[PDB]
Amino acid sequence: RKYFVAANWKCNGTLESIKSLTNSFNNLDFDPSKLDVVVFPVSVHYDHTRKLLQSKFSTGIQNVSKFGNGSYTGEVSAEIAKDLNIEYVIIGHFERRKYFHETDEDVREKLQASLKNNLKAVVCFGESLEQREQNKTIEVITKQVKAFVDLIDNFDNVILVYEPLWAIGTGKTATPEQAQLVHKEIRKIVKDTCGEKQANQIRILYGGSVNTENCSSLIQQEDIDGFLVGNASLKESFVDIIKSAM
Amino acid sequence: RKYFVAANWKCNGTLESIKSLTNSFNNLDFDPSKLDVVVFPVSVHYDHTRKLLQSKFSTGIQNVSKFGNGSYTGEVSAEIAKDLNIEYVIIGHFERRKYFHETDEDVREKLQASLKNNLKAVVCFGESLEQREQNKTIEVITKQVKAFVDLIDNFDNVILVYEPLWAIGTGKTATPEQAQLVHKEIRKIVKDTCGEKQANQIRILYGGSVNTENCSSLIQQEDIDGFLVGNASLKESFVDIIKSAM
Numbered sequence: 432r433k434y435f436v437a438a439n440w441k442c443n444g445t446l447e448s449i450k451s452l453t454n455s456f457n458n459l460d461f462d463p464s465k466l467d468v469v470v471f472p473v474s475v476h477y478d479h480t481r482k483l484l485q486s487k488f489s490t491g492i493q494n495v496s497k498f499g500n501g502s503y504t505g506e507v508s509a510e511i512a513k514d515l516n517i518e519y520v521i522i523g524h525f526e527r528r529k530y531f532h533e534t535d536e537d538v539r540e541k542l543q544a545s546l547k548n549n550l551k552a553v554v555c556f557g558e559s560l561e562q563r564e565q566n567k568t569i570e571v572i573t574k575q576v577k578a579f580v581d582l583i584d585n586f587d588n589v590i591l592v593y594e595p596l597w598a599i600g601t602g603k604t605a606t607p608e609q610a611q612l613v614h615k616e617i618r619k620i621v622k623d624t625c626g627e628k629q630a631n632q633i634r635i636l637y638g639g640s641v642n643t644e645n646c647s648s649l650i651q652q653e654d655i656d657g658f659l660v661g662n663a664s665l666k667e668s669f670v671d672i673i674k675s676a677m
Numbered sequence: 678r679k680y681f682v683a684a685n686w687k688c689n690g691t692l693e694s695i696k697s698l699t700n701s702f703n704n705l706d707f708d709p710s711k712l713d714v715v716v717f718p719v720s721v722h723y724d725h726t727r728k729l730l731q732s733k734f735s736t737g738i739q740n741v742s743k744f745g746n747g748s749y750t751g752e753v754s755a756e757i758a759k760d761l762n763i764e765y766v767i768i769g770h771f772e773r774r775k776y777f778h779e780t781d782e783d784v785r786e787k788l789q790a791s792l793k794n795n796l797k798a799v800v801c802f803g804e805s806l807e808q809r810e811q812n813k814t815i816e817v818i819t820k821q822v823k824a825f826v827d828l829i830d831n832f833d834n835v836i837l838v839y840e841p842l843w844a845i846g847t848g849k850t851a852t853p854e855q856a857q858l859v860h861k862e863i864r865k866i867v868k869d870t871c872g873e874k875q876a877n878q879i880r881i882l883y884g885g886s887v888n889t890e891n892c893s894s895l896i897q898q899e900d901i902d903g904f905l906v907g908n909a910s911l912k913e914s915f916v917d918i919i920k921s922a923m
């Protein structure tokens with residue numbers, strides 16, 4: 432499996448900070464055939480970012496609509512993304528599930544619209560603290576994946592991302608071993624719903640707090656194939672994180 | 678007061694179609710100092726559209742976040758829009774209230790965020806068919822305006838838009854007179870909550886179905902200062918609607 436390292440800049444950046452960050456990133460030598468490295472800037476920065484990054488870097492947007500083209504003010508459709516050759520789209524990120532009520536149904540619809548339009552999707556999911564304390568991790572994760580995994584036609588085009596909400600801003604820390612346990616389980620689900628061959632080829636990224644100190648210990652786990660980096664991807668030291676997957 | 682004509686392309690467009698629609702818009706000879714003409718393309722189409730449109734036209738985005746910069750995947754903040762020199766933002770469009778659960782409450786926060794960053798805002802509101810048949814029009818409007826009127830500091834920077842939901846998609850039609858009566862009432866509410874000078878300078882656009890065959894009748898009403906055109910703004914004939922206002 433090819434490792435995958437994605438930078439989700441979320442809602443950050445200015446024309447000038449991006450110019451400075453992209454320059455640093457372009458300095459890093461890596462072979463895109465052996466490693467996928469994707470950057471996800473804010474939508475209004477997509478074009479600026481795509482022109483500043485060397486083609487070895489892939490780019491994508493942080494959200495796509497579940498609707499097609501039409502009367503949907505403020506939405507960006509898969510059809511529109513396709514016309515711009517936008518390669519990746521993030522779906523189901525917890526911030527959208529939390530602040531903008533996105534449901535498993537929405538996640539499903541968006542993945543369907545994305546695949547139909549040849550876009551590659553990075554799908555997020557994970558349990559919260561209350562859910563982990565009740566020992567419902569497995570149950571929750573199973574129900575979230577099964578909400579969209581039948582739509583996956585091609586296992587190189589859909590990337591899964593495990594987000595340990597229970598460890599996001601709650602003060603509890605997730606260990607590499609703990610991440611690995613969940614990742615192994617996720618792969619099992621994919622295995623017993625899509626096939627053993629399919630399960631071994633789909634990338635499952637860890638999406639908790641990743642930095643230059645813990646990345647090597649996370650990437651080394653058997654079922655962790657890369658990351659979805661948050662704030663650490665807003666720094667020049669991001670290149671160090673990429674290197675841990677080389 | 679200065680008429681305002683806006684094109685809300687919603688979720689439509691390809692690189693080619695925009696490069697064809699904008700060439701047609703640029704042929705129109707008009708003075709930007711006497712009329713405000715704004716085009717709102719899909720966020721990922723912003724740069725492309727800004728580059729193709731002559732400075733006569735102003736540009737903006739169909740939505741803006743109620744949060745600032747930070748961990749809000751997929752959202753476009755007001756400061757980010759400012760750094761890009763984006764001049765207008767649409768807030769509270771019924772499609773965002775309907776399909777995405779935006780409340781008057783999110784409207785006020787987005788308007789606060791926009792003004793706080795010196796962006797000009799186009800705020801939308803209007804009553805449904807069920808609220809109209811029950812004579813509830815004025816009550817509903819008054820509540821929607823009250824949700825954010827106090828935030829308006831400069832009354833040339835906030836543009837109000839009345840969307841007659843009851844006559845949108847219902848199969849019902851809104852006569853210019855029927856529109857003028859609501860606008861007059863809206864302007865009275867501004868007058869009684871902000872002052873007479875304030876109410877006389879603020880623009881209130883008709884945001885119902887507008888085309889070439891009825892634009893003249895509407896702009897003539899003394900309390901209707903322009904429009905937020907949807908579908909019709911996607912046709913080259915949109916220049917005729919702009920003409921009706923000069």
Ligand SMILES: O=C[C@H](O)COP(=O)(O)O
Nearest residue numbers: 439640659660661662663
């Ligand atoms: O993908 C993104 C994440 O939730 C990251 O979190 P972060 O802001 O701590 O890097």
Ligand SMILES: O=C[C@H](O)COP(=O)(O)O
Nearest residue numbers: 685886905906907908909
């Ligand atoms: O601003 C936009 C509107 O709801 C318009 O409607 P339309 O699609 O009939 O032009």
